[PDB]
Amino acid sequence: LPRLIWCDGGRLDKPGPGNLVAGFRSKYLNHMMNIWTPENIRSSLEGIENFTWLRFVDTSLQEAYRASHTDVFARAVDLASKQNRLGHMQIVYDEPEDKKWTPVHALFQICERENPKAVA
Amino acid sequence: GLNLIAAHSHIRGLGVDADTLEPRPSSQGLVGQEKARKAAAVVLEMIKQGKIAGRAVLIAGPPSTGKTAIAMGMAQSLGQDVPFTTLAASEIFSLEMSKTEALTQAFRKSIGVRIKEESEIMEGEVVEIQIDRSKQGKLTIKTTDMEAIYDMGSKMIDAMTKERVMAGDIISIDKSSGKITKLGRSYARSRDYDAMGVDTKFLQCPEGELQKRKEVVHTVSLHEIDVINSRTQGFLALFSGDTGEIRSEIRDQINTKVAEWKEEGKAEIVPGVLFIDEVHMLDIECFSYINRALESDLAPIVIMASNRGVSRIRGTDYKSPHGLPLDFLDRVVIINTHPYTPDELRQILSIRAQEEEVDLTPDALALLTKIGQEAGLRYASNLITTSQLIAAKRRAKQVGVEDVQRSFKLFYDPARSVRFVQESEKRLIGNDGVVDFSY
Amino acid sequence: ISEVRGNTRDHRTAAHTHIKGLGLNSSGIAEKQAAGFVGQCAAREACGVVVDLIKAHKMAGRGVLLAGGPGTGKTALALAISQELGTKIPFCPITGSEIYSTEVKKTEVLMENFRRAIGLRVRETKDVYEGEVTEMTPEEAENPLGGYGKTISTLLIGLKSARGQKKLRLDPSIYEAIQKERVQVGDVIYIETNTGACKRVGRSDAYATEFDLEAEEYVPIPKGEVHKKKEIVQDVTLHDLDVANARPQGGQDIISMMGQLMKPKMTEITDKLRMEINKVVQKYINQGVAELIPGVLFIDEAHMLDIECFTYLNKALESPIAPIVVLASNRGIATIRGADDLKAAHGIPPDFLQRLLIIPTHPYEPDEIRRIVRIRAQTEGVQLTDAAVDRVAEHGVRISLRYCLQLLAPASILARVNGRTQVDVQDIAEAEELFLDARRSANILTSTGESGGLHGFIS
Amino acid sequence: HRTAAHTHIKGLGLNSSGIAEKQAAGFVGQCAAREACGVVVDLIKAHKMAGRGVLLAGGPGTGKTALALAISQELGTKIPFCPITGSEIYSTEVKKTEVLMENFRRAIGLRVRETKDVYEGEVTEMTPEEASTLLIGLKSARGQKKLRLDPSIYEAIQKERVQVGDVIYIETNTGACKRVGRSDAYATEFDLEAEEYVPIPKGEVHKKKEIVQDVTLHDLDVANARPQGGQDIISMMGQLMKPKMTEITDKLRMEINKVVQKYINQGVAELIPGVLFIDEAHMLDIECFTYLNKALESPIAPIVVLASNRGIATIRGADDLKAAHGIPPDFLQRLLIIPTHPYEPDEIRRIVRIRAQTEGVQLTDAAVDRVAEHGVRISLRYCLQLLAPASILARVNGRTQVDVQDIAEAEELFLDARRSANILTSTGESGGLHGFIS
Amino acid sequence: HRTAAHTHIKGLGLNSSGIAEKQAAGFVGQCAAREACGVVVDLIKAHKMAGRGVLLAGGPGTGKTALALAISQELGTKIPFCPITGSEIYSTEVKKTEVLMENFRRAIGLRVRETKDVYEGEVTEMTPEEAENPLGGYGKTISTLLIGLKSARGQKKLRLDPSIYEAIQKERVQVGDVIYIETNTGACKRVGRSDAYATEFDLEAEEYVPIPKGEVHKKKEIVQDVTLHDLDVANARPQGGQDIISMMGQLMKPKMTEITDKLRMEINKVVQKYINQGVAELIPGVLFIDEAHMLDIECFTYLNKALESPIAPIVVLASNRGIATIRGADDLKAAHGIPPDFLQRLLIIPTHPYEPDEIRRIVRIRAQTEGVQLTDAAVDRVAEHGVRISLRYCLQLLAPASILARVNGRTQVDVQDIAEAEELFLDARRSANILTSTGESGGLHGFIS
Numbered sequence A: 001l002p003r004l005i006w007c008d009g010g011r012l013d014k015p016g017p018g019n020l021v022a023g024f025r026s027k028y029l030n031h032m033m034n035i036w037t038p039e040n041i042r043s044s045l046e047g048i049e050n051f052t053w054l055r056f057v058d059t060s061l062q063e064a065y066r067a068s069h070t071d072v073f074a075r076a077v078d079l080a081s082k083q084n085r086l087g088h089m090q091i092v093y094d095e096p097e098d099k100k101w102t103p104v105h106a107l108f109q110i111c112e113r114e115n116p117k118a119v120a
Numbered sequence B: 001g002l003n004l005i006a007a008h009s010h011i012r013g014l015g016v017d018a019d020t021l022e023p024r025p026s027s028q029g030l031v032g033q034e035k036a037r038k039a040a041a042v043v044l045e046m047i048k049q050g051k052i053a054g055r056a057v058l059i060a061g062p063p064s065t066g067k068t069a070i071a072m073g074m075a076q077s078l079g080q081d082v083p084f085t086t087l088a089a090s091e092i093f094s095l096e097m098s099k100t101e102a103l104t105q106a107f108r109k110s111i112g113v114r115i116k117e118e119s120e121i122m123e124g125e126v127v128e129i130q131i132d133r134s135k136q137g138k139l140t141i142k143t144t145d146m147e148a149i150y151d152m153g154s155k156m157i158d159a160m161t162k163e164r165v166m167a168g169d170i171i172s173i174d175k176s177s178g179k180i181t182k183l184g185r186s187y188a189r190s191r192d193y194d195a196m197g198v199d200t201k202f203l204q205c206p207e208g209e210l211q212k213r214k215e216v217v218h219t220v221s222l223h224e225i226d227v228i229n230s231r232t233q234g235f236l237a238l239f240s241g242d243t244g245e246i247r248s249e250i251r252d253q254i255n256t257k258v259a260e261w262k263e264e265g266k267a268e269i270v271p272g273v274l275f276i277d278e279v280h281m282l283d284i285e286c287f288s289y290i291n292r293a294l295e296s297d298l299a300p301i302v303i304m305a306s307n308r309g310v311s312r313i314r315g316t317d318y319k320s321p322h323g324l325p326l327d328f329l330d331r332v333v334i335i336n337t338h339p340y341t342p343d344e345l346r347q348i349l350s351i352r353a354q355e356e357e358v359d360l361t362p363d364a365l366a367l368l369t370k371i372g373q374e375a376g377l378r379y380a381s382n383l384i385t386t387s388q389l390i391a392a393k394r395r396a397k398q399v400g401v402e403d404v405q406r407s408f409k410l411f412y413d414p415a416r417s418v419r420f421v422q423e424s425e426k427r428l429i430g431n432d433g434v435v436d437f438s439y
Numbered sequence C: 001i002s003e004v005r006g007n008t009r010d011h012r013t014a015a016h017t018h019i020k021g022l023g024l025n026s027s028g029i030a031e032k033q034a035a036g037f038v039g040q041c042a043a044r045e046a047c048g049v050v051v052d053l054i055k056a057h058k059m060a061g062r063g064v065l066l067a068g069g070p071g072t073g074k075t076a077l078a079l080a081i082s083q084e085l086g087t088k089i090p091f092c093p094i095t096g097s098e099i100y101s102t103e104v105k106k107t108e109v110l111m112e113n114f115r116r117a118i119g120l121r122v123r124e125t126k127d128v129y130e131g132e133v134t135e136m137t138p139e140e141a142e143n144p145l146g147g148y149g150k151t152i153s154t155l156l157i158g159l160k161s162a163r164g165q166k167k168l169r170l171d172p173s174i175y176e177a178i179q180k181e182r183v184q185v186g187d188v189i190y191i192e193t194n195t196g197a198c199k200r201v202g203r204s205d206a207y208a209t210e211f212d213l214e215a216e217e218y219v220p221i222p223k224g225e226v227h228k229k230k231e232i233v234q235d236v237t238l239h240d241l242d243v244a245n246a247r248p249q250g251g252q253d254i255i256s257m258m259g260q261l262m263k264p265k266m267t268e269i270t271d272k273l274r275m276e277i278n279k280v281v282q283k284y285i286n287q288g289v290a291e292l293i294p295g296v297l298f299i300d301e302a303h304m305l306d307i308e309c310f311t312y313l314n315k316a317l318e319s320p321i322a323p324i325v326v327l328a329s330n331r332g333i334a335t336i337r338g339a340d341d342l343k344a345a346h347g348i349p350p351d352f353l354q355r356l357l358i359i360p361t362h363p364y365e366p367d368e369i370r371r372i373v374r375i376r377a378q379t380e381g382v383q384l385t386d387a388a389v390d391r392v393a394e395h396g397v398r399i400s401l402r403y404c405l406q407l408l409a410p411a412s413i414l415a416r417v418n419g420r421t422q423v424d425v426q427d428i429a430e431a432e433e434l435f436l437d438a439r440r441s442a443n444i445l446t447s448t449g450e451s452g453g454l455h456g457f458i459s
Numbered sequence D: 001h002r003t004a005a006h007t008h009i010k011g012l013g014l015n016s017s018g019i020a021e022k023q024a025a026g027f028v029g030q031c032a033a034r035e036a037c038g039v040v041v042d043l044i045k046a047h048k049m050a051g052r053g054v055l056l057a058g059g060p061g062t063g064k065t066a067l068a069l070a071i072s073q074e075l076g077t078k079i080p081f082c083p084i085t086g087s088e089i090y091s092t093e094v095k096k097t098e099v100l101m102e103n104f105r106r107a108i109g110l111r112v113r114e115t116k117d118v119y120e121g122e123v124t125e126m127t128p129e130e131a132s133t134l135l136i137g138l139k140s141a142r143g144q145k146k147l148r149l150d151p152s153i154y155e156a157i158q159k160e161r162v163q164v165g166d167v168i169y170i171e172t173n174t175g176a177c178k179r180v181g182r183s184d185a186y187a188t189e190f191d192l193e194a195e196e197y198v199p200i201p202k203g204e205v206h207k208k209k210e211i212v213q214d215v216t217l218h219d220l221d222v223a224n225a226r227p228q229g230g231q232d233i234i235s236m237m238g239q240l241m242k243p244k245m246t247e248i249t250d251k252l253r254m255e256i257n258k259v260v261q262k263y264i265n266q267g268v269a270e271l272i273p274g275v276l277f278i279d280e281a282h283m284l285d286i287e288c289f290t291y292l293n294k295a296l297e298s299p300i301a302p303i304v305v306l307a308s309n310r311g312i313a314t315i316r317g318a319d320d321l322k323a324a325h326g327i328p329p330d331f332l333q334r335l336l337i338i339p340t341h342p343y344e345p346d347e348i349r350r351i352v353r354i355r356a357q358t359e360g361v362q363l364t365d366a367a368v369d370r371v372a373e374h375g376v377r378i379s380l381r382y383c384l385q386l387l388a389p390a391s392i393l394a395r396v397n398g399r400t401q402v403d404v405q406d407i408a409e410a411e412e413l414f415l416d417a418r419r420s421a422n423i424l425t426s427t428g429e430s431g432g433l434h435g436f437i438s
Numbered sequence E: 001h002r003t004a005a006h007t008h009i010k011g012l013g014l015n016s017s018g019i020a021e022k023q024a025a026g027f028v029g030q031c032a033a034r035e036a037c038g039v040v041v042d043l044i045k046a047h048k049m050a051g052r053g054v055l056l057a058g059g060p061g062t063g064k065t066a067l068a069l070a071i072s073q074e075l076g077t078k079i080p081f082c083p084i085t086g087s088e089i090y091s092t093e094v095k096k097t098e099v100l101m102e103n104f105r106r107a108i109g110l111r112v113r114e115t116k117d118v119y120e121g122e123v124t125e126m127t128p129e130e131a132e133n134p135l136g137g138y139g140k141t142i143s144t145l146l147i148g149l150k151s152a153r154g155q156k157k158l159r160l161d162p163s164i165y166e167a168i169q170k171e172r173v174q175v176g177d178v179i180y181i182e183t184n185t186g187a188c189k190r191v192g193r194s195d196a197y198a199t200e201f202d203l204e205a206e207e208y209v210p211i212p213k214g215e216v217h218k219k220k221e222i223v224q225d226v227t228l229h230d231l232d233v234a235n236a237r238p239q240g241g242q243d244i245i246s247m248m249g250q251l252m253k254p255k256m257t258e259i260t261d262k263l264r265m266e267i268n269k270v271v272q273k274y275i276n277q278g279v280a281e282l283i284p285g286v287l288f289i290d291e292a293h294m295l296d297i298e299c300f301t302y303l304n305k306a307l308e309s310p311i312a313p314i315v316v317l318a319s320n321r322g323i324a325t326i327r328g329a330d331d332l333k334a335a336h337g338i339p340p341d342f343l344q345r346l347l348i349i350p351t352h353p354y355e356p357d358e359i360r361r362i363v364r365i366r367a368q369t370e371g372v373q374l375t376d377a378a379v380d381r382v383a384e385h386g387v388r389i390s391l392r393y394c395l396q397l398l399a400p401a402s403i404l405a406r407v408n409g410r411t412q413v414d415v416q417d418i419a420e421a422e423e424l425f426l427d428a429r430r431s432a433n434i435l436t437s438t439g440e441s442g443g444l445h446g447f448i449s
């Protein structure tokens, strides 16, 4: 390939002289006008607004923003650094008086909090 | 803004005397159709009470008789208190999933789970961080109005390091999670640098107290809880789609858990409406699923509209009324809309002319009302905005008769277009592909 | 945190909410009106034997057909079976429409639902120590190893639950888990005796005030005994064992982890997995540690199955571990969905029809309709005058059972918006005019849609 | 420049009153249809109306696609014009309604103005100044400048392999940076190194430029649905990792509307609703038209221009239903319909002259008359195709202009479909050795 | 050992003059067709013409498939013979014209000499050296590995590239292992423990292997047989490097892809260079499309392009159909079920139905091949069924009758055993009469129609 195509702005995503679109579009579509940035999510976090569920899915605004922007390999590495603590609660919070206790910030994480595997 | 003037923008509610459900002849944008509007108001009372599960209501009638207008009016007067999922029947034909799977989703979008929550959240601009790498440390953080020093635990210092927190960052700490979010930088720090990273955002500093605590009400559909549980970060699929055919033992387990949340008062269930517009585009396999789906304790009320006469049911070769199986119609009560009278047309044209802010002369509205009687409501409605643009080329203040007349000659109504096709039989391409390009 | 809703917790009502059972004597004879049923006495008696067949667990892959016109109570009878069996017996209802997955061949979908309908009950003992960690304390060994700075012979852990305190004299090797799990004093943990390891549940909320900011979720102290030994009963369908084997869940590698982050498509599981599962399941049944619970697969609108589905069910029903399959159909003489030149009764292929016990459901007499109206009214909580019961039942006879039942909720509203708690003929006469039936609406299509040029129906 | 079929059409050729000139901007005739298209232009430029539908209807070769392209140019480049054929809707990758929905949003534009603050120079210094903030010194032939760097753009500069003596480009507002090379003042550090030596920038080291940037609502959808570009490196494996189109949910499109409105209120972004043109609209099936009923009723929706050349024809996907234009009658009620009529002999002569002088072909007037006869008797579209061959034939005969002999020679070399149909008839007498396969 | 339908066919049975011996190499008759198939064999061995088509046209059971199998044996194992049915073209993963091209390129062989340039030895020492990446975020990285390899004859210390060290990590190498490092790929293979550590007292079944003889560094010459399709596939879904794409390509599900003509023309140039370098020779072969009537109008249209390719193989089609409808072209009927257009490209070898005495002779060849002894009355009786019913039918009786004979203790099949086989095992037409006679009545005992 000629460097005009492969290096000097024949690739649309890579910014440089002779690709003035790419640097703008990178900032605005991934940060400014991006629904997943924490400043945008926090405006919609309530009521019947579109991120209302976020309160209960066991993830932070920072983590929601990370998962929207990193690819499935990078996310899978981050997932290595995590613990099946909702599965351990199934071992521990067990009696009727424990009332199947679940962290309210993990309330919608239903199938993780109860499945046969952890008990087995 | 983004909300430009659309076809149903004038419909602001159902227009009924709420204590008695009697439709007022013209109010909230709806005109006429009192029998249909009263039946729609009774359906609202079933919806708002929520005790009745899985009624199906079909709104039937000729084209341009308010079947969508009435369903939009119900959405406007039901209010965001209750889910109102609007499904075009064409959308059920997914490649990502089964037809019945796509319907199972649309049914569950229409049932809300409502939770009321106290969240305790600290947000402020970071003044400084101190660490005793002798672990412990102190965070100094401010609003415009308050400032404090906080003792940080070691795990908090680790998380602060991982988030690369520095002075001038706006951060939030969720006390329940114990998790930091870097929200951005204060506008006061805009002068720190000559070049900024792509990911950086400026904010106003937080304001009021630091450790705000708020009563929040959350309304979440059963479909959202499905998609969240479908896979490890399924909440991403809420936006991209990409759910697949969510396995039923997930849905059964979610339904069981939501029943506990109601029993314990942790949540309330908010049944809503699914409106399936142009339902005759569903096929025989769809209707068979919907038969069983309506018979469920967590079914919404389903409303649907059709304009078909006796017509072939899709997925078979016999005809039936409305295009629907008689087996299905046995579960449905039917609301019929009717054609409008000339005086009801005159009002609807006035309502539309107001929304588009067009000043019709009385004679323009008269002529335009005749056109709507002769050529259909939508056609006359389309000539309102057209005549405005033609009058503006005259720099005229009001739409005159001549502007409606010129709009009429330039734009053919359907009946005049169908005539034009017949007179052009051999120059247009027929159903057998033959055409003659010669003069 | 969550604000509890304290006011009311009443049930919704749906088309079958009145059906409570088959309504049969101890002799199995049907009572003319019981458990919400009216009539169908012969069909209820036959379904009563079906319940006894299922509950006896003797037989595999028997087929039943419910046959009869629309509205004749076929799905009501299926729901009554599910209630007679109770929630311990698996009950997997589908329509024939649900088989046409886009992800897998429709015979896999049919076999999935087929093995959802088979339950397995496994009894095991759970045996764990639990608490917040009150203390961790090494004991030096009496014979320390040469060249090593410390030799530890025991690692004492104090565990506190809400109900007691215990000093666990653990084997020293648990140091591995404590380091890797980062167990502190005050963290809630369990130790499982089948491994001797430990897992960290979290930090006890007794310490939630240690700092102004900490990245901890705080968890309550366990409200059980400090030592929890008990038997636990696990209920799984054999489909759960299929998926647990074909899509293993716990994998630590990059490919497993990318897997669990992507759309989890179902896959056309092999007969040799299912057969290998069956053979090991049968081992544990013979050991007596598991018991098989054959349930019911109910296929509604079974006329929507095509001939490829039916020819597979032939094979499936012959397998030794199979549910009872209940079909329901209403299609008279009809074309088989996949064989456009074969017409048969019920729309069921004659080859397959020979397998089924067939139960007919007949139409309802006018007096049965009237009894159902009252049962349905008292289920929706509507109060009627007796003249209103008669007028409603007249629509049931003249038009449809379903139609007349559906007017009760509209009429209830029109009554109360006139200040009346009891619905009367004047309200029924308004419900029936706001809400047409299929036939009166079809008459409008014939009359107003007599032409289509404008203001006519699209046809 | 190249010459496509419509390159002579510059615009609708309307007067200030909106009356069509009998011949202007490359059109001949269609005055009624051009005037009606002029009103559609006003509807588009008066930003206030969503979801108005238009139909162009008339025979093949009567100028429907010329009229849609004339609208596009009267509308200028600012406003989105999104042309598709009804045939493009049949993706194998998402349902037809998603393909229509994506094209609805490609027609709605959002204009932003950035002041791009560009620094480009040889790196003179890279000194840390924080516990991490740098000072970068940049040099050009005209001076030096030092920039305090945000810790994150510093990492961007560090992921590029920038060192002292390199030439770099920086967008200090967007946070983009590029290594252009190593400055050729260092070209003799060694006699061989695998390095790209470039001259020091001769201009000002800092440049400020006004850029008007256009995106569409669909670009926002795509960007919010999935990690894009260099964020999604694993996409290189293909198979499951390919950036497939997905069935974007309304929940996503509603969040994008909300976030976009925020930036409109702040005046950062300017909304620009445009046109979706669906040519060959009769190729849409009954399920597509059903969705277009709903889709045109959202309050953000472009103006949709259909074209059809069908008479009474079966609706695709609904064999029982026949209607005019091949458009189901339910949907035809919504549309403003413009008829396009057949051209007359003298109008054809005029279109021929316009096409000749657009292709640069010079004709004798006898050649004009002979070509125009073929438009009357065969097809306008067949006239115009003959001009380019006849120009070649003329020049190899050494002539400076096309004449009757070159037209007559071109006619014989290049048959129309009517004469070739006569050949198919006379030769297709049998499946024998010389027969066409029937 | 196992005997199939064609186990007696050994070749075309031709003279050096190219004339069919009336019974040779397992054949009886088909002499004109065997002679034509001889000329096809010689067209292939000449390896000079691309893209010539042959139709074996003739009724079912007339030996069309036997002849194609005989061609394969006359060509021998050097030449690619690629047999398919038309039913195999209908992949779900890729378009039907893709599997045509794959099979066209499986029919073209290449023999190539390859130099493996390789290191071997017992690993004596192994020591990593590291880079202090400041701001990559992934932490430190190993910059090289130093490894000591010892053979019987000599020793080296290698400073390996990081991507070759990753290969050693994948191979779980330790000090004292014997390893192989192919520098072509950068792949590493662990051969075993050195025999110097040979001890019973390890729980795992280690391969204790002797120290490599010769130098640590070697060059091996290997002659490889590949097809063009193997090269296409290798380069479409790469797996040979130690880069990250190759690494992950070994973990993802195998998947066919619609390999572009750009890749195929590029691989022609690669192979042309091996030819010009003298390391390779082209071995163009033959694609046999059995059941070619099961192709469709899109396949046949594609062959009109594909057979024009200047390296296309020889294509042999078999069809058993008279005037029949072309699939996917339901209005068009033509002889053989082949479009008239594409039929003009082929040389048609018609095959003919057998005479009673040829059938009798086939029965003996086939009986000898299955290893079963018949009386002449038995051979005559079976031959009668070959005449009256079908050759295939009469040959199917030999195996049943042998068992039935052995069951009575007689080792030789006689007429009573065939007489029993006839009644246990019906032909298609006796079964079709049972259908029709019973099909007079429905009810419980009717056949389902």
Ligand SMILES: Nc1ncnc2c1ncn2[C@@H]1O[C@H](COP(=O)(O)OP(=O)(O)O)[C@@H](O)[C@H]1O
Pocket (backbone or CB within 6 Å): B007, B008, B009, B011, B029, B030, B031, B032, B033, B062, B063, B064, B065, B066, B067, B068, B069, B070, B307, B348, B351, B377, B378, B381
């Ligand atoms: N009763 C009504 N009051 C006000 N506007 C109406 C009424 N009925 C129809 N319209 C308007 O006329 C147009 C066509 O009616 P609509 O209900 O959308 O058609 P359909 O009857 O085919 O569903 C829409 O713009 C709609 O808002």
Ligand SMILES: Nc1ncnc2c1ncn2[C@@H]1O[C@H](COP(=O)(O)OP(=O)(O)O)[C@@H](O)[C@H]1O
Pocket (backbone or CB within 6 Å): C015, C016, C017, C019, C036, C037, C038, C039, C040, C068, C069, C070, C071, C072, C073, C074, C075, C076, C077, C372, C375, C401, C402
């Ligand atoms: N014997 C009965 N007693 C009480 N209610 C019945 C009876 N049969 C039917 N119903 C009710 O009438 C309606 C029609 O019955 P359903 O089971 O839906 O008919 P089918 O399944 O045959 O279409 C349902 O609402 C059902 O609950």
Ligand SMILES: Nc1ncnc2c1ncn2[C@@H]1O[C@H](COP(=O)(O)OP(=O)(O)O)[C@@H](O)[C@H]1O
Pocket (backbone or CB within 6 Å): D005, D006, D007, D009, D026, D027, D028, D029, D030, D059, D060, D061, D062, D063, D064, D065, D066, D067, D309, D351, D354, D380, D381
């Ligand atoms: N009124 C006109 N004046 C000049 N050129 C025209 C006119 N109408 C059509 N053309 C040209 O003639 C050709 C045929 O018209 P086109 O618009 O493609 O037909 P269709 O209506 O079938 O799409 C095109 O090259 C177009 O540019």
Ligand SMILES: Nc1ncnc2c1ncn2[C@@H]1O[C@H](COP(=O)(O)OP(=O)(O)O)[C@@H](O)[C@H]1O
Pocket (backbone or CB within 6 Å): E005, E006, E007, E009, E026, E027, E028, E029, E030, E058, E059, E060, E061, E062, E063, E064, E065, E066, E067, E320, E362, E365, E391, E392
């Ligand atoms: N000339 C022959 N000599 C010996 N065996 C033959 C001959 N022709 C056919 N057969 C055998 O008879 C059977 C039918 O021939 P086959 O090639 O399968 O027919 P088709 O043309 O249908 O492929 C095969 O077992 C084959 O080996």
